[PDB]
């Protein structure tokens, strides 16, 4: 005999962990504060070319 198998079919299903994420308000506020601090610190370096 001589069997031919396709790799696009003998694969399990997609896990249930592929749903949307869940973030709290504290984490969002912390990320926003960090981004604001980084943006404010980067602006000081742009003025070095005075």
């Amino acid at each position: 005999h001589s069997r031919e198998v396709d790799c696009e079919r003998f694969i399990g299903p997609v896990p249930s962990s592929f749903t949307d994420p869940k973030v709290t308000s504290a984490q969002w506020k912390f990320l926003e504060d960090m981004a604001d601090m980084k943006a404010l610190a980067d602006l000081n370096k742009s003025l070095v070319n005075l």
Binding site: H1, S2, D6, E8, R9, F10
Partner: protein, 50 residues
């Protein structure tokens, strides 16, 4: 599909060869489910500054 050679031999007489080709449709699980979606906002205010 899967072909095979059913090379059968006779009894203790003569001694002739044979191939005998025959195939059998072989099933398989379904193929992947390709997903390609995208969503965005239509258009609100066309100004370039604000």
């Amino acid at each position: 599909l899967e072909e095979h050679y059913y090379s059968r031999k006779t009894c203790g007489s003569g001694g002739g060869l044979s191939v005998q080709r025959t195939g059998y449709p072989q099933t398989d699980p379904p193929v992947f489910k390709a997903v390609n979606s995208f969503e965005r906002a239509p258009l609100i205010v066309g100004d370039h500054v604000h």
